[PDB]
């Protein structure tokens, strides 16, 4: 806890505003208050005159739609001196330093005599406020000119909290009274006197716009306008009583922008409404009670951490929108009522205002989700979560924050089509003051209802919505809007639910004698798309049908059809970004591949069933030693192979799946390792013999393995199943491990580091490989979108020639980080969201100082507890102590399976490690500079190939796509298994050997999959090299240079680049075509 407390204090002092810029502002707006008093009074006027008073003035009054007309504006207008006051966070002294800039809210209370008791009807009082604001702006401008301050002051109108009904004046300073350096700007809020209108008449259920329907938004707008100072004094006493109010406020302040939460309007579409005030007001309600027994949930002696924790706990578990609502007394213990108003509500009986009116139903659940998931991290003790909770902005990119995004282009966008304007209709102005608010609610309801359980959260955002307009104009002007609609287009942003996202059918109400109301809305909403259909269980229900596609999800089809039918037949729905990523995933050569969804693992399952058939044959067979167990460890068994398995597609490098066979423990094993394996091969030899005899339909052949260095006797059996799949078999022996432990002990002290490396890769293939597949296969079920993303990440590595040095496991452990550790984000449910998160993590990963450790567990045991946790960092510190620069090891990837942390990240050259991080940052920077689109995505997935010193072009004799199982084909294995060689791509093997010969000087790379990244025909592959700095320049020759060099002087040599090329060309033979140096 002490670490967290000090982290808070460090965080505060970083964000504390500088007191000098404070003293500068009070110098200004104190003088501004003198200007306010200078303004003269005014007499009673009608709308007809004031239009003539403002007809020629530069100022124009900001009437709110519907503007007063001469008939209904018989009310008169007058101005009188206001009661100048300062409110907001600045009044409470709870503000912080903001690079974008902060705001000072000063309130002007119009005198009570300017109102009649019934002026809260039909926008009566508001129109008085608008002219009052306008009359101020006229006199402020001339008095601003008189005092010569206008040179560095810019004045513009704006809407308070993006509320169209509350225009306000905006005072900002451009580059003695100049406060531009302060990054502060004053807001002029024209509020009403307290208790001008009976608050009972202004309840959310009541109405105040005659046409009856309730008007919660307008009722709050007027009533909130009359209640500003009252909540100031309410917050003031709480700050006095509890010492940690301001500290808790600023922690809540910071948490909000990281999640993109503000006090602005949300019914318009923007995520927000919850600011400091809604945070701080909820503090006081809970400090005064909050429980179902009116018991205090927060005690005034609580520290900053405890005050913040309870509310993050409060918002997380108590529901304030659908079932339950909280009431408190500003002027009386706060009580949690079980009844709910179906909208977020924090009622105040003293003031009769619901502060949570600005909260949309959709945003509240999103808010509740963030509170709950932070509470889990707040309770977390194993890992420090201070940076994630506070020092990480999740709102920078919508795609990273939100799984799917659809942008909808409404028709005729210098006004909306007559039909769409007609749909808004008179009935909804009273309910929803602006069309932007109405259309968002229309889009949410149809989109929410159409998708249903397929999604978790839905957000509708009005792209290009402005809130500030010049004083010369009455209402904000959008270039597309034409003073009609303040937006460019709407974007439908979704949090999809992986469990039921790809469900082929949307279940509806059951059949009955009399069509029920739920059935009524069900048939009407989907129309022809609706149908009554029966299932195997015998249930009769109304249902609609969708068709899966390998390019798009079912959601794109639903949102398109649902939105066109209800909102507008002319709208255009397009999400091409997700389409590109789906296409970049290879399309297998299986029946109905195009119709198959990206979440379907049928291809992997058919491989397992074929293995099961061979799994039975091997056991019933009689051997000198009984078979203990057969453990498949291949990539396809863990749903990670770059291309899905295809029958007889043996050009796929992943065609042969590793399988570990272990026989029963015996004491007759040879104690000599070369004798040990020749006994191992003698097993597989017998397995081949009776397998050939008893089951002739299976074909088999042996091959050598050289993955373990110096262990040149390993022989593996490759079994070609009749189904069209290949399996590769190797022995595991209990003696094998200890012999390697014997191997390290006897070695000379100089050779021991080399031998342990041999042991490291042995356990990576034999011992730890079993554990990696077991855990990953189980965890993959919970993370439905882990399967698609990891291939696309590996596909991305192959395009940039990184898979050759990166073991497949390391990519998997990297790709799973956003899921077991999704904070501060949510678990991805989309291919684009999951992939970009992997790229983001690499961009911000400091592998020199920050270790990567994961809990390979299903979502909330095997979780890392504190003792095992601390052990792993202690390993990282010890390794970094010996390797501070990280030259020997770069990525420290550890887990329960790998506590050492060096198992799957050893042997990678430093250039490749920096290249991996280099591409990720440029990828993130590319997304920053240019938003996600088709051109960027192609730019992400294409290789530069220029920075490489020399580039070698290869072309295979035949196209390898069709034998690789990729749809732009063999149907049986060759009669002679030697013919298999003719249809392989060896370039992955070629590069490996040349690395060994030229490790000291060159780093060659090649594309491991040629069928996927080999152009149209999948026959083109490239070898790219790099000359190290030392041998790039001239060197004095020595027997230990260990390089191919040419003499220049008697005692100097230089790299012989051309001789290297000829060796590559001869070794490539016909495959090599062109050389670029």
């Amino acid at each position: 806890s002490n670490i967290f407390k000090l982290q808070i204090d460090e965080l505060l002092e970083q964000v504390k505003l500088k007191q000098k810029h404070v003293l500068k502002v009070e110098k200004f707006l104190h003088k501004l208050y003198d200007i306010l008093q200078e303004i003269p009074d005014w007499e009673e006027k009608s709308l007809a005159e004031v239009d003539s008073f403002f007809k020629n003035k530069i100022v124009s009054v900001p009437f709110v739609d519907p503007k007063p007309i001469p008939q209904n504006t018989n009310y008169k207008f007058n101005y009188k001196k206001p009661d100048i006051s300062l409110i907001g966070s600045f009044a409470l002294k709870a503000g912080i330093y903001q690079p974008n800039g902060s705001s000072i809210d000063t309130l002007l209370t119009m005198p009570k005599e300017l109102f009649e008791k019934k002026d809260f009807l039909n926008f009566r009082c508001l129109h008085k406020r608008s002219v009052y604001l306008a009359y101020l702006t006229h006199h402020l401008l001339i008095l601003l000119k008189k005092d010569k301050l206008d040179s560095f002051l810019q004045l513009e109108y704006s809407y308070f909290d993006n509320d169209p009904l509350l225009p306000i004046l905006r005072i900002s300073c451009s580059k003695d009274y100049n406060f531009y350096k302060t990054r502060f700007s004053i807001n002029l809020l024209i509020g009403f006197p307290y208790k001008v209108f009976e608050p009972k008449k202004l309840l959310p259920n009541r109405n105040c716009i005659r046409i009856l329907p309730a008007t919660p938004l307008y009722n709050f707008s007027v009533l909130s306008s009359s209640t500003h100072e009252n909540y100031l004094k309410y917050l003031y006493k709480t700050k006095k009583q509890t010492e940690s109010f301001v500290e808790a406020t600023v922690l809540g302040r910071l948490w909000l922008q990281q999640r993109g939460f503000s006090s602005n309007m949300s019914h318009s579409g923007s995520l927000g409404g919850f600011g400091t005030f809604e945070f701080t007001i909820l503090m006081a309600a809970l400090l005064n009670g909050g429980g179902i027994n009116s018991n205090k949930i927060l005690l005034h002696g609580f520290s900053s951490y405890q005050l913040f924790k309870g509310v993050i706990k409060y918002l997380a578990t108590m529901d304030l929108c659908h079932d339950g609502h909280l009431q408190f007394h500003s002027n009386p213990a706060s009580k949690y009522i079980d009844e709910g108003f179906q909208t977020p509500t924090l009622f105040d009986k003293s003031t009769k205002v619901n502060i949570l009116t600005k909260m949309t139903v959709s945003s509240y659940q999103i808010l509740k989700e963030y509170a709950g998931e932070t509470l889990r991290m707040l309770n977390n003790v194993v890992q420090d979560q201070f940076s994630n909770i506070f020092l990480t902005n999740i709102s920078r990119f919508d795609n990273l924050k939100y799984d799917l995004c659809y942008d909808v282009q409404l028709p005729l966008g210098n006004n909306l089509e007559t039909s769409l304007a007609a749909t808004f209709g008179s009935m909804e102005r009273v309910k929803f003051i602006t069309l932007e608010n109405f259309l968002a609610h229309k889009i949410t309801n149809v989109a929410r209802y159409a998708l249903g359980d397929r999604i978790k959260y839905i957000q509708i955002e009005m792209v290009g919505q402005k809130s500030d307009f010049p004083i010369t104009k009455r209402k904000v002007y959008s270039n597309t809007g034409g003073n009609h609609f303040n937006f460019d287009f709407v974007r439908v942003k979704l949090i999809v639910n992986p469990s039921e996202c790809d469900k082929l059918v949307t279940k509806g109400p059951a059949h009955s004698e009399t069509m029920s109301t739920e059935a009524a809305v069900f048939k009407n909403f989907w129309g022809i798309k609706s149908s009554l259909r029966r299932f195997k269980d015998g249930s009769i229900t109304h249902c609609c049908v969708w068709s899966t596609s390998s390019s798009e999800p079912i959601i794109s089809s639903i949102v398109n059809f649902a939105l066109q039918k209800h909102v507008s037949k002319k709208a255009q729905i397009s999400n091409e970004t997700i389409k590109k990523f789906h296409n970049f995933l290879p399309l297998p050569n299986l029946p109905s591949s195009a119709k198959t969804s990206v979440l379907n693992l049928s291809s992997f399952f058919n491989l397992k069933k074929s293995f099961d058939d061979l799994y039975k044959i091997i056991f019933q067979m009689k051997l000198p030693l009984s078979v203990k167990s057969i453990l498949p460890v291949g990539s396809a068994f863990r749903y990670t192979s770059l291309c899905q398995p295809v029958p007889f597609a043996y050009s796929d490098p992943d065609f042969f799946q590793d399988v570990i066979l272990e026989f029963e423990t015996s004491p007759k094993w040879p104690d000599e390792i070369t004798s040990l394996e020749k006994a191992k091969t003698a097993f597989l030899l017998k397995i081949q013999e009776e397998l050939s005899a008893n089951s002739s339909t299976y074909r088999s052949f042996f091959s050598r393995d050289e993955s373990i260095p110096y262990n040149l006797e390993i022989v593996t059996l490759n079994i070609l199943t009749p189904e069209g799949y290949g399996f590769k078999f190797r022995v595991l022996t209990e003696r094998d491990e200890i012999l390697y432990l014997r191997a390290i002990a006897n070695a000379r002290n100089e050779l021991k580091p080399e031998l342990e490396a041999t042991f490291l890769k042995f356990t990576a293939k034999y011992l730890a490989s079993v554990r990696h597949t077991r855990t990953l296969e189980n965890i993959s079920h919970s993370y439905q979108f882990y399967s698609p993303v990891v291939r696309l990440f590996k596909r991305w590595l192959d395009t940039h020639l990184l898979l050759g040095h990166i073991t497949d496991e390391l990519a998997e452990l990297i790709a799973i980080k956003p899921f077991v550790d999704p904070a501060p984000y949510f678990i991805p449910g989309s291919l684009e969201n999951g992939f970009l998160k992997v790229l983001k993590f690499i961009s911000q990963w400091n592998w020199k100082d920050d270790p990567l450790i994961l809990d390979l567990v299903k979502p909330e045991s095997e979780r890392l507890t504190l003792a095992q946790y601390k052990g792993i960092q202690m390993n990282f510190t010890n390794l970094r102590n010996s390797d501070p620069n990280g030259t020997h090891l770069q990525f420290f990837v550890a887990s329960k399976n790998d506590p050492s942390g060096i198992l799957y990240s050893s042997g990678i050259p430093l250039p490749i490690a920096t290249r991996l991080t280099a591409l990720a940052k440029v990828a993130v920077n590319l997304l920053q500079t240019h938003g996600l689109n088709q051109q960027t995505i192609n730019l992400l997935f294409t290789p530069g190939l220029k920075d490489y010193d020399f580039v070698v072009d290869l072309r295979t004799p035949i196209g390898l796509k069709s034998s690789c199982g990729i749809l732009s084909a063999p149907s049986n294995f060759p009669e002679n298994l030697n013919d298999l060689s003719e249809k392989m791509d060896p370039t992955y093997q070629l590069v490996k050997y040349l690395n060994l010969k030229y490790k000291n000087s060159l780093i060659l790379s090649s594309r491991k999959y040629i069928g996927v990244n080999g152009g149209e025909k999948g026959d083109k592959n490239v070898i790219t090299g790099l000359i190290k700095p030392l041998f790039k320049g001239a060197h004095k020759f020595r027997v230990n240079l260990d390089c191919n060099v040419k003499p220049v002087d008697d005692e100097n040599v230089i790299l012989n680049k051309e001789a290297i090329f000829h060796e590559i060309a001869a070794f490539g033979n016909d495959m090599v075509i062109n050389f670029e140096t």
């Binding site: 990280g886 430093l910 490690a913 440029v922 530069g944």
Partner: peptide, 14 residues
């Protein structure tokens, strides 16, 4: 165009 990054061999990029 292409996603091209200067090769860093001193780990200076991090």
């Amino acid at each position: 165009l292409s996603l091209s990054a200067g090769f860093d061999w001193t780990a200076s990029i991090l």
